[PDB]
Design a protein around this ligand. Structure first.
Ligand SMILES: Nc1ncnc2c1ncn2[C@@H]1O[C@H](COP(=O)(O)OP(=O)(O)NP(=O)(O)O)[C@@H](O)[C@H]1O
Lengths: 563, 205, 583
DNA sequence: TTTTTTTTTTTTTT
C-alpha cells in the first residue's frame, strides 16, 4: 500500500522548447508555457499480475515496461509461457495519467513564428493541477516516444514529462483587527480605493460594495433571491469613469472585462459551434464563464446595441443563462455582478432626460441593474485648477508618491476576510426599512414618467442588497437603521439623478398642473388655459369619446367648482 | 545567412548629435527624405518613435508610451508613402487599408495546424504589433466591426480571447499611425470641423 | 471466500426482515410491489445499511461488484417467500442501490475509484438504441455452457442462450455545472435490464454504477503507454426520482375530499412570491394539464394549456415562471430567444464519418407531456418563433431539414412570459396596440395574463412587508406534497362534463362574444371558446372529481372573464358591466 | 495475410 513519487523544484534555469535538444534526455529541466487540450485521466499500469501462462502461475510483479504488454515473460516455472499472459488486472496497482499538450508562449516567441510545441504528460499526483491558458514551471525528463532507425532482429519523437509541476506563470488578521477597530475605516475604505480617480465619491463605495458579496441565497422553496448588486455608471465622455473599470480588473479577483460590440452576441452566450467538425454542436462558453462569481464589466451600451441587451439579462434575473441556437438543451451558472458604463446617448446631460430614455435601453434590464449612479463631468474654474492639481498629480510620473490610507493588497485580504461574513438583518428595525421603502415609492408615485420605473418592487430587494454589503463594510452583522439609511439615500441621489374617480383625475391635475408648474412659474393667468394643454395629454390615454368628454366637461365642472 | 548590439564609440557620437541643435528638426528631415514640407508631421513622427515612458506604479497603471496619431487631407497626400516607409523602418510594423479592417480580422484566428491536424492559437496582426507601430488607411471608412478592435486596445491596451479550448487575455501595446481622407475628399472651406473629420466628436475624443 | 457465505447468511437478515419507521419493512412492501408490478427492479436504501452494519457498507468500497451477486440472489429468496414464484417470472433480479455518497461529480476520478462502488451524476447526451446482450452461452449440445461477458469472452457456440438488454450511453457533465474554462470531458456508461433506455437525451440524471477500465483498449499510439479506458456500468439510474406510493396517495385522496383544496393550491403556487392570487390560479391551472382528448378517429383537439403572460418591469413576472420547473414533473426552459437552449427548432444533423442524418428533437421533444417555458417575446426573432405556432396546433413538430419524411409528438403546455412593448403599461388604447407579436400567434394562447401596475399605496405595504418578511430566511400544502399532487392526478384522473348543465356555456358564451363585438377585436377565437372547457377540466383534475361538476366551470369561466376584461382598454369600463351575469 | 477515402450536398449561424 505504498508507492512513492518524487518531485524536484526550484530548478537552475527555465529552458525554451526551441532550447529542447537530445542531451536533455533523462535529465531534469524547467520549462513553462500555455496549455492545449487537457485529455481525460486514465490509469498507469505500473505493475500487473498477469498469469498464467498455462494454466495458473499467478505471477504478480513488474511488467512496468513502456508498451505496456506483456507479462508471461519467462514464467512460471513450470508453466512455460509464452501462451496467454493471461492478463490479471485486479492485483495491478494503477496511477494517474493525462496527456496535456503545452503550447509555447506568445510573449517570447518571435513573430512570425507559429510556435512548435509538444506534449507534457502529467505522471505523478501533479496530474490535473494545470488549467488551460496558464504558463507553468515543469520538470524536464526529456526522453522519447514510439509510434530512420529500426531494431533489426521504427520512429521516435520528443516526449516531455515532469515528475514535478507548479502553476507559476495568518498574522495579517491581526492587521485586520487593527483595521476593524476604527470608526474611520468606513471613510478610509472609501478614500483608499482608486487613486487613479479623483472625486466622484459615493460611486466609489458601490464598487467596493460590488466586490463585497450579498445574501444571494434563499428563501427557498422555490427560487433563490438576489443577492449581488449592480451599477451602470454614466456621464459625459472625458468623464474618466473607465478608470474605474481598469480598477475593477486591476484589483478584483477573476475579473472578466470586454467593452466591445463584438463578442459576438455569443459572447457570454454559447455559440453553438457547428461544425466541430465531426458531429459538431460544440458548446462555446463563451466570454463570461470564468466570469462566474465575479465582477463583469462592459463599456458603451450604445455599442452593444439592443439585440443582446436582455440576452445578457438572463443572468440579471435568473442569475443563470440557458443558450439557444437549436444546439443541445442547456442552462449555465452565471451568478455575477455586472457593472458597466455607457456613454449617454446625448453624450451628456440631457438633464431633462428621465434616465429611462437617457440610456436607450429597456426597463427590464435597466431597473434590474441598481443603481446606475450618474456623474456629469463639467468644468469649473477652481475645479479646472484642481483637475490641474490632482489629475495632474496622476498625470505626474512624480509625484505619484501620494498614497491611500490602505495598501491595496491589504484591502484585498481585508475583502477575502470580509467575504467570510454572512451578515443578516432579521432585526425588527427592518420595520423602518418598510416605511423607508414605502416612502421610497410615495414620492416616485407621480410622475410615473419620473424616476419611475415605479420604483421597482425589486428595488426593495435592492434596498436590502445594499445593506448586505454595508455590513461587510462595517464588519458587524445584523446591520442597523443607519446602515440602510446610507444606502437608501445613496439610491435616492441617482434616482434623483433621474429627476430633473371622476374628480380623482380632476384633483389629480388641479394640484398636479401646479405641481409641475407652480414651482417653475407662477401658476397664473386664466382658469381655462389649464384645460387646453390638458386636452392634449388627456385624449391620448383615454379609452373612448365618452372618456374624452369627461375629460372636457369635468375640466369645466371642477373649474366652476373652484370658481 | 540573411537576404544589433550597439558599438560604444558611436554612442558618444549620439551625444555629439545631441549637442547638435537641430536634431529635433534634423532627424525629422532625415525621417522622410521623400516628402516635401509638412514638417509638423516629420516633427510628430520623430517624437512618435521616442513616444512616452512606462508607468508601472505599485499596480495598475501601464499608460505606456503608446501614441495613436491620425493624419488626413487632400486625397493621396503621399501619406501612404510615409506609412509604407515608417512601416519598414520598424522592429514590428503594421499596415492595412480602410474597409480592409474589421473586428474579426486582426486578432487570434485560432486556426488548425492543418498538416498535423491540431488547432493551435494564432497571433493576429495586432498581437505582433505589440510594441512598435501600426498603420492603416482612412478611419472615416473603417467598418463597424472595425474600431471594435480599436475600442479594445486603445485603453484596455490588451486583448481578450477565451474561445475554443484555451483562455488568454494577452497584452498589445504600440504607437500607431493611420492615414486617411476627409469625406470630400476635400473637407471644404469654413464649416464645423467634427463632421468634416467625419465621425462623431465623441469617437474623436 | 466461502466464509462470505456466512456474510450472505446475515445480509439476508438485513435484506428481508429488517424494519424501519415502526415496522412495515420497505422490503416486504417493494417485494410485494413488484411483485404486483412485476417490474423485476428492486430498489435498495443505503439509508438503512449504514444504520445497521457499516461493515457490509464498506464492502461496497472494496468489491461491491460480486457482493450484489449473492445479495440480490437472496432478495429473490426473500421475494420468493413473499411470492413462491418468479421461477416462471424472470428467474433473476438485480438490485438498484439508491444513493450512496460518495457524491463525486465527474472530472475528478482516480484509479482508486475503480472496482469500488461509486455514485455519479450528469446530463444525458447522445445515446445508442438497444442491442440485446448475449449472456450465458448455451446450445443443443451440440463443449458446454460458458458465461459471457462483461465484456470479453476470451479465450464457438450457442442456441438457447439467455439474452438480456444492453445499451451503451455517452453521458456528459452539465454545461451549467461545468467548472469554468473547461471543455466538457465526458464518460461512457453501460445500461442493462430495466435500467435500459430509461434515461432520455438532454436531462440531468444519477448513474449509480461501478467503474470498469479494461483493457488496452485501444488507445496505445495516442498514448504510448498502458491506459485502460473509462467506462462505468450503472447498477441503477434516477432522474434529477419522485413518484407516489400507496400510503402517500391514500392520504393524498384524503386531501382531495375536502372542499377548498383547489383553493389551498392557489396560495401554494407562489410561496415566496406572494404577488397576485389572480395569476397563480391560471398558473397551476395550466400546470395541471388536461384530458387529451380524442374524437375517433379524428382530431384530438387540445387538453394542454397555452399561457400568455404579458409582462411589466419590476413585476414578479420573471420570478413566477421558474417556479414551474421544480414544480413540473417535466419542463423545458427556453427563456425567450437570443436564446436559451434550445431555440425550439427540431433539427437534423448527419452524424460523423459515414452515417445518414440523425434527427435531434426540438427541446419540446424533451418536454413531451410536460411544459415548455418562455420569457421575453420581444427578444425572439421571427425565425425561431414560427415553429412555436406549430406545436400548439398539431401537438407535434414538423421541420424542414432534410432527407427524411417524419412526424413527431409534442404534448408540451406552454407558458408565455413577455415584457410589454417599451416600458410599463402600454395601451390605454386597445391592448391589441400593446403586443408586438401577431394576433394569429396570440389568440393561440388560451390564458391572457395581464400584470400591473401604476403605483397603488397599500398593496405594496402588503406585499413588501411580506417581502422583507420573506427575506428573513437565510395554509400552503407542503411543497413535496403538491408536486406529488398535480403529477399524481396527471397520470390518472380524467374529467368529463355532462351536456345537461353545459349548454349554459353555449348561451353564456353567446353572452361572452355578442358584445365582444362591442369594443375592439378580437382577441377571441372559436378556439378561445374551446379552451374554457380545458380550463375547467383541470380544476376537475385538482378536485379529482373524475368528471366535471357545475362549479368546476365557474372557476374556468370566471378566469376567462377578466382574462379578457382588463385586457380591454379603458373602454373596458363598459365591458365590466356586461360580463357581470357571467360571475 | 492485409491492403484503402476528401467533395458535395445540406445545414444552422453570426
Ligand atoms: N410578489 C412579488 N411581486 C413582485 N416582485 C416580487 C415578488 N416576489 C418577489 N419579487 C421580486 O421582484 C423581482 C422582479 O422580477 P421580474 O420583474 O420578473 O424581472 P423582469 O422585469 O421580468 N426582467 P424581464 O423578464 O427581462 O422583464 C423578482 O425577481 C423578485 O426578486
Amino acid at each position: 500500500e505504498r508507492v512513492f513519487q518524487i518531485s524536484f523544484f526550484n530548478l537552475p534555469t527555465v529552458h525554451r522548447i526551441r532550447d529542447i535538444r537530445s542531451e536533455k534526455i533523462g535529465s531534469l529541466l524547467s520549462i513553462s508555457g500555455t496549455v492545449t487540450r487537457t485529455s481525460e485521466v486514465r490509469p498507469e499500469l505500473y505493475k500487473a499480475s498477469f498469469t498464467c501462462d498455462m494454466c495458473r502461475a499467478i505471477v504478480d510483479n513488474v511488467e512496468q515496461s513502456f508498451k505496456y504488454t506483456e507479462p508471461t515473460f519467462c514464467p512460471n516455472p513450470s508453466c512455460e509461457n509464452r501462451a496467454f499472459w493471461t492478463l490479471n488486472v485486479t492485483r495491478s496497482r494503477f496511477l494517474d495519467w493525462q496527456k496535456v499538450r503545452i503550447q509555447e508562449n506568445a510573449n517570447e516567441i518571435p513573430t512570425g513564428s507559429m510556435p512548435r510545441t509538444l506534449d507534457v504528460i502529467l505522471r505523478g499526483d501533479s496530474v490535473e493541477r494545470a488549467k488551460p491558458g496558464d504558463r507553468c514551471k515543469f520538470t524536464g525528463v526529456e526522453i522519447v516516444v514510439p509510434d530512420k532507425p529500426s531494431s533489426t532482429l521504427l520512429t521516435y519523437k520528443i516526449s516531455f514529462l515532469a515528475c514535478h509541476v507548479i502553476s507559476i506563470g495568518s498574522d495579517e488578521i491581526n492587521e485586520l483587527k487593527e483595521m476593524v477597530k476604527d470608526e474611520h475605516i468606513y471613510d478610509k475604505l472609501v478614500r483608499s480605493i482608486a487613486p487613479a480617480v479623483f472625486g466622484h465619491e459615493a460611486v466609489k463605495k458601490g464598487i467596493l460594495l460590488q466586490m463585497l458579496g450579498g445574501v444571494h441565497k434563499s428563501t427557498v422553496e422555490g427560487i433563490k433571491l438576489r443577492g449581488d448588486i449592480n451599477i451602470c455608471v454614466v456621464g459625459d465622455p472625458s468623464t474618466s469613469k473607465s478608470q474605474f473599470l481598469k480598477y475593477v480588473v486591476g484589483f478584483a479577483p477573476r475579473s472578466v472585462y470586454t467593452s466591445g460590440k463584438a463578442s459576438s452576441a455569443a459572447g457570454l452566450t454559447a455559440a453553438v459551434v457547428r461544425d466541430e467538425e465531426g458531429g459538431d454542436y460544440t458548446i462555446e462558453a463563451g466570454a463570461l464563464m470564468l466570469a462566474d462569481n465575479g465582477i463583469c464589466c462592459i463599456d458603451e451600451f450604445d455599442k452593444m446595441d439592443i439585440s443582446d441587451q436582455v440576452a445578457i439579462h438572463e443572468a440579471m434575473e435568473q442569475q443563470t443563462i440557458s443558450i439557444a441556437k437549436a444546439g443541445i438543451h442547456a442552462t449555465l451558472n452565471a451568478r455575477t455582478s455586472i457593472l458597466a458604463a455607457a456613454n449617454p446617448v446625448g453624450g451628456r446631460y440631457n438633464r431633462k432626460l428621465s434616465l429611462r430614455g437617457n440610456l436607450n435601453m429597456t426597463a427590464p434590464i435597466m431597473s434590474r441593474f441598481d443603481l446606475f449612479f450618474v456623474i456629469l463631468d463639467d468644468c469649473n474654474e477652481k475645479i479646472d485648477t484642481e483637475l490641474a492639481s490632482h489629475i495632474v498629480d496622476l498625470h505626474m510620473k512624480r509625484d505619484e508618491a501620494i498614497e491611500p490610507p490602505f495598501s491595496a493588497e491589504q484591502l484585498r485580504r481585508y475583502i477575502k476576510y470580509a467575504r467570510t461574513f454572512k451578515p443578516i438583518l432579521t432585526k425588527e428595525a427592518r420595520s423602518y426599512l418598510v416605511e423607508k421603502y414605502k416612502e421610497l415609492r410615495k414620492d416616485d408615485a407621480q410622475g410615473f414618467s419620473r424616476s419611475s420605473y415605479r420604483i421597482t418592487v425589486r428595488q426593495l430587494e435592492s434596498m436590502i442588497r445594499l445593506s448586505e454589503a454595508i455590513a461587510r463594510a462595517n464588519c458587524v452583522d445584523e446591520i442597523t437603521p443607519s446602515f440602510i439609511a446610507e444606502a437608501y439615500d445613496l439610491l435616492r441621489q441617482s434616482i434623483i439623478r433621474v429627476d430633473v374617480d371622476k374628480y380623482v383625475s380632476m384633483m389629480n391635475m388641479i394640484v398636479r398642473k401646479i405641481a409641475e408648474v407652480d414651482r417653475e412659474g407662477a401658476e397664473e393667468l386664466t382658469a381655462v388655459d389649464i384645460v387646453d394643454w390638458y386636452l392634449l395629454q388627456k385624449e391620448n390615454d383615454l379609452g373612448s369619446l365618452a372618456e374624452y368628454w369627461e375629460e372636457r366637461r369635468l375640466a369645466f365642472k371642477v373649474i366652476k367648482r373652484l370658481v | 545567412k540573411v537576404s544589433r548590439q550597439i558599438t560604444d564609440q558611436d554612442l558618444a557620437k549620439i551625444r555629439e548629435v545631441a549637442a547638435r541643435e537641430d536634431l529635433y528638426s534634423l532627424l525629422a528631415r532625415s525621417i522622410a527624405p521623400s516628402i516635401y514640407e509638412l514638417e509638423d508631421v516629420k516633427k510628430g513622427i520623430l517624437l512618435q518613435l521616442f513616444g512616452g515612458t512606462n508607468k508601472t506604479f505599485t499596480k495598475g497603471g501601464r499608460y505606456r508610451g503608446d501614441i495613436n496619431i491620425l493624419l488626413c487631407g487632400d486625397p493621396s497626400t503621399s501619406k501612404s508613402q510615409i506609412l509604407q516607409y515608417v512601416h519598414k523602418i520598424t522592429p514590428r510594423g503594421v499596415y492595412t487599408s480602410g474597409k480592409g479592417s474589421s473586428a474579426v480580422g486582426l486578432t487570434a484566428y485560432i486556426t488548425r495546424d492543418v498538416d498535423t491536424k491540431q488547432l493551435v492559437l494564432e497571433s493576429g496582426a495586432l498581437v505582433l504589433s505589440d510594441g512598435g507601430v501600426c498603420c492603416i488607411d482612412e478611419f472615416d471608412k473603417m467598418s463597424d466591426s472595425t474600431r471594435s478592435v480599436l475600442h479594445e486596445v486603445m485603453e484596455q491596451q490588451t486583448i481578450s480571447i477565451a474561445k475554443a479550448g484555451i483562455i488568454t487575455t494577452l497584452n498589445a501595446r504600440s504607437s500607431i499611425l493611420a492615414s486617411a481622407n476627409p469625406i470630400g475628399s476635400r473637407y471644404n472651406p469654413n464649416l464645423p470641423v467634427t463632421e468634416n473629420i467625419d465621425l462623431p466628436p465623441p469617437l474623436l475624443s | 471466500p466461502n466464509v462470505s457465505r456466512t456474510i450472505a447468511r446475515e445480509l439476508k437478515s438485513f435484506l428481508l426482515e429488517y424494519t424501519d419507521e415502526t415496522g412495515r419493512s420497505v422490503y416486504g412492501a417493494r417485494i410485494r410491489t413488484l411483485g404486483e408490478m412485476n417490474s423485476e427492479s428492486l430498489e435498495v436504501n443505503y439509508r438503512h445499511l449504514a444504520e445497521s452494519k457499516a461493515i457490509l457498507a464498506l464492502f461496497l468500497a472494496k468489491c461491491p461488484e460480486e457482493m450484489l451477486k449473492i445479495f440480490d440472489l437472496v432478495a429473490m429468496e426473500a421475494t420468493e417467500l413473499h411470492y413462491p414464484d418468479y421461477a416462471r417470472i424472470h428467474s433473476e433480479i438485480h438490485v438498484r442501490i439508491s444513493d450512496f455518497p460518495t457524491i463525486y461529480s465527474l472530472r475528478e476520478l482516480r484509479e482508486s475509484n475503480l472496482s469500488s462502488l461509486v455514485r455519479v451524476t450528469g446530463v444525458v447526451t447522445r445515446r445508442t438504441g438497444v442491442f440485446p446482450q448475449l449472456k450465458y452461452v448455451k446450445f443443443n449440445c451440440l463443449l458446454g455452457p460458458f458465461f459471457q461477458d462483461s465484456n470479453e469472452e476470451i479465450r464457438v457456440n450457442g442456441e438457447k442462450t439467455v439474452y438480456r438488454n444492453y445499451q451503451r450511453v455517452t453521458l456528459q457533465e452539465a454545461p451549467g455545472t461545468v467548472p469554468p474554462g473547461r471543455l466538457p470531458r465526458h464518460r461512457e456508461v453501460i445500461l442493462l435490464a430495466d435500467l435500459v433506455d430509461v434515461s432520455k437525451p438532454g436531462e440531468e440524471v444519477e448513474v449509480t454504477g461501478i467503474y470498469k477500465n479494461n483493457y488496452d483498449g485501444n488507445l496505445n499510439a495516442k498514448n504510448g503507454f498502458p491506459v485502460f479506458a473509462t467506462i462505468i456500468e450503472a447498477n441503477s439510474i434516477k432522474r434529477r426520482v419522485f413518484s407516489w406510493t400507496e400510503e402517500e396517495e391514500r392520504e393524498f385522496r384524503k386531501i382531495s375530499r375536502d372542499r377548498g383544496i383547489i383553493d389551498k393550491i392557489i396560495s401554494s403556487m407562489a410561496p415566496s412570491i406572494y404577488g397576485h392570487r389572480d395569476i397563480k390560479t391560471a398558473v397551476a391551472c395550466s400546470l395541471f394539464g388536461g384530458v387529451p382528448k380524442n374524437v375517433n378517429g379524428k382530431h384530438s383537439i387540445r387538453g394542454d394549456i397555452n399561457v400568455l403572460l404579458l409582462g411589466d418591469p419590476g413585476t414578479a413576472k420573471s420570478q413566477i415562471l421558474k417556479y414551474v420547473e421544480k414544480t413540473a414533473h417535466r419542463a423545458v426552459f427556453a427563456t425567450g430567444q437570443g436564446a436559451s437552449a434550445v431555440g425550439l427548432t427540431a433539427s437534423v444533423r448527419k452524424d460523423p464519418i459515414t452515417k445518414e442524418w440523425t434527427l435531434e428533437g426540438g427541446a419540446l421533444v424533451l418536454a413531451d407531456k410536460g411544459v415548455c417555458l418562455i420569457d421575453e417575446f420581444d427578444k425572439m426573432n421571427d425565425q425561431d418563433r414560427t415553429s412555436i405556432h406549430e406545436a400548439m396546433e398539431q401537438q407535434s413538430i414538423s421541420i424542414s431539414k432534410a432527407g427524411i419524411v417524419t412526424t413527431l409528438q409534442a404534448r408540451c403546455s406552454i407558458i408565455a412570459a413577455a415584457n410589454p412593448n417599451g416600458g410599463r403599461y402600454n395601451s390605454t388604447l386597445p391592448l391589441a396596440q400593446n403586443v408586438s407579436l401577431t394576433e394569429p400567434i396570440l389568440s393561440r394562447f388560451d390564458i391572457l395574463c395581464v400584470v400591473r401596475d401604476l403605483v397603488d399605496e397599500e398593496a405594496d405595504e402588503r406585499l413588501a412587508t411580506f417581502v422583507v418578511d420573506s427575506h428573513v430566511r437565510s395554509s400552503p400544502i407542503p411543497q413535496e406534497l403538491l408536486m406529488k399532487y398535480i403529477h399524481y392526478a396527471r397520470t390518472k384522473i380524467y374529467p368529463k362534463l355532462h351536456q345537461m348543465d353545459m349548454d349554459k356555456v353555449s348561451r353564456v358564451y353567446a353572452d361572452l362574444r355578442r358584445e365582444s363585438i362591442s369594443t375592439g377585436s378580437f382577441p377571441i377565437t372559436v378556439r378561445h371558446l374551446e379552451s374554457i372547457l380545458r380550463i375547467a377540466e383541470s380544476f376537475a383534475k385538482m378536485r379529482l372529481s373524475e368528471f366535471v361538476s357545475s362549479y368546476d366551470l365557474d372557476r374556468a369561466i370566471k378566469v376567462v372573464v377578466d382574462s379578457f376584461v382588463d385586457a380591454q382598454k379603458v373602454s373596458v369600463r363598459r365591458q365590466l358591466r356586461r360580463s357581470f351575469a357571467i360571475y
